[PDB]
């Protein structure tokens, strides 16, 4: 944003934002799935107790 | 300088021990063409290379 003319920055920024958002989305989805597995284990522990 | 290098056998020079003055070259506008890539042509002389 401090190096390129505003519209040039907008293009380079859009590339970077998209990259960062897709990396976060992948991360969040994977945690959501692992979190579900953890919930299942917690439910088993509660049953054992 | 009145003599720019032959293109057949042109030679690159290296710059050091400078105060950046992109905005000076640009504002004096002695050259007719100022087209920049990666650096805004609109006097971006805030950067240090």
From Swiss-Prot, chain B:
Mutagenesis / variant outcome for changing residue 30 to P: In strain: Omicron/BA.1, Omicron/BA.2, Omicron/BA.2.12.1, Omicron/BA.2.75, Omicron/BA.4, Omicron/BA.5, Omicron/BQ.1.1, Omicron/XBB.1.5, Omicron/EG.5.1
Top-level lineage group: Viruses
Phenotype upon changing residue 32 to F: In strain: Omicron/BA.1, Omicron/BA.2, Omicron/BA.2.12.1, Omicron/BA.2.75, Omicron/BA.4, Omicron/BA.5, Omicron/BQ.1.1, Omicron/XBB.1.5, Omicron/EG.5.1
Consequence of substituting residue 3 to K: In strain: Mu/B.1.621
Effect seen on changing residue 28 to L: In strain: Omicron/BA.1
General function of this protein: Attaches the virion to the cell membrane by interacting with host receptor, initiating the infection. The major receptor is host ACE2. When S2/S2' has been cleaved, binding to the receptor triggers direct fusion at the cell membrane. When S2/S2' has not been cleaved, binding to the receptor results in internalization of the virus by endocytosis using host TFRC and GRM2 and leading to fusion of the virion membrane with the host endosomal membrane. Alternatively, may use NRP1/NRP2 and integrin as entry receptors.
Quaternary context: Binds to host ACE2. RBD also interacts with the N-linked glycan on 'Asn-90' of ACE2. Cleavage of S generates a polybasic C-terminal sequence on S1 that binds to host Neuropilin-1 (NRP1) and Neuropilin-2 (NRP2) receptors. Interacts with host integrin alpha-5/beta-1 (ITGA5:ITGB1) and with ACE2 in complex with integrin alpha-5/beta-1 (ITGA5:ITGB1). May interact via cytoplasmic c-terminus with M protein. May interact (via N-terminus) with host bilirubin and biliverdin, thereby preventing antibody binding to the SARS-CoV-2 spike NTD via an allosteric mechanism.
Name this polypeptide is given: Spike protein S1
Lineage: Viruses, Riboviria, Orthornavirae, Pisuviricota, Pisoniviricetes
Residues represented out of the complete protein: 344 to 392 of 1273
